[PDB]
Amino acid sequence: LFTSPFYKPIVQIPDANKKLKQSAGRGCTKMKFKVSKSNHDLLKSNKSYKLYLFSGFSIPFIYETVGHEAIDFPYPCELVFNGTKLEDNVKGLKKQNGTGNPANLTPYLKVPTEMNHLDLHYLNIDKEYSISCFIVEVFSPEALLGKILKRPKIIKQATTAYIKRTLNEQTSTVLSLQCPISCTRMKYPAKTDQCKHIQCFDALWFLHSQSQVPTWQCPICQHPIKFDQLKISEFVDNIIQNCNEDVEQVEISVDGSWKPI
Ligand SMILES: [Zn+2]
Numbered sequence: 001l002f003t004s005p006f007y008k009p010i011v012q013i014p015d016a017n018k019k020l021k022q023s024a025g026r027g028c029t030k031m032k033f034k035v036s037k038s039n040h041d042l043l044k045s046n047k048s049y050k051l052y053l054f055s056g057f058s059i060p061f062i063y064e065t066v067g068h069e070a071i072d073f074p075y076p077c078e079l080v081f082n083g084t085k086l087e088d089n090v091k092g093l094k095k096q097n098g099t100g101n102p103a104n105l106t107p108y109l110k111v112p113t114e115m116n117h118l119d120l121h122y123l124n125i126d127k128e129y130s131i132s133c134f135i136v137e138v139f140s141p142e143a144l145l146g147k148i149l150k151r152p153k154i155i156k157q158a159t160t161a162y163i164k165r166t167l168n169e170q171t172s173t174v175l176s177l178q179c180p181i182s183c184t185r186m187k188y189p190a191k192t193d194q195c196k197h198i199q200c201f202d203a204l205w206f207l208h209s210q211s212q213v214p215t216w217q218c219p220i221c222q223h224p225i226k227f228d229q230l231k232i233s234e235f236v237d238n239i240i241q242n243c244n245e246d247v248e249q250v251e252i253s254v255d256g257s258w259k260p261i
């Protein structure tokens with residue numbers, strides 16, 4: 001589904017749809033389609049435009065839209081576009097559904113006058129799938145970080161109020177300045193207002209992780225979050241800007257004050 005911030009649709013490619021039906025065993029599904037010269041000119045008009053293949057669960061017996069499906073490729077799958085195998089990690093996190101990525105067909109496209117062949121080899125198919133192709137504008141983690149930075153941060157007053165309201169449980173708590181993902185000093189300590197914890201994670205490393213495994217779960221509380229909920233924490237940010245690189249942890253009291261450990 002186009003709920004991802006890394007790619008957004010510009011136009012659907014016609015005659016590039018396909019339904020994959022259940023198969024007991026071995027099989028291969030073929031798709032022929034052409035990409036008009038106008039769509040080639042559009043791809044050339046902007047460096048951020050790519051041709052992405054999408055696969056989703058095809059829920060039967062009801063109406064479904066072209067994009068609303070969460071990205072789910074049949075696992076295992078071998079995708080071959082114009083003879084060249086696609087090395088894309090199309091379906092990451094095999095254990096979870098909806099954590100797949102699209103396949104980039106842009107570099108292996110043929111001229112408009114010729115035909116594009118997409119083969120999909122499989123050993124079995126337990127559920128029906130919908131296959132689509134879209135031209136999309138892609139965004140890198142750095143641009144998305146820029147978007148996050150331009151947002152209003154989580155004010156330090158809110159964090160101090162939360163600390164004071166929490167530590168009255170029945171002495172001190174440890175705030176890490178390190179990122180759980182990168183294991184390095186955070187540069188962009190971020191989280192969500194939905195998160196019930198003062199600990200943060202580096203926004204850039206989070207976006208880097210999600211760009212290859214779209215779980216969209218907080219690396220700390222594992223709650224499902226969304227891109228537009230990410231905001232910088234002014235409290236941890238100020239603590240970092242006023243600390244030496246040596247410090248990895250910090251002691252926090254009910255006062256909101258903080259001491260290097
Ligand atoms: Zn959280």
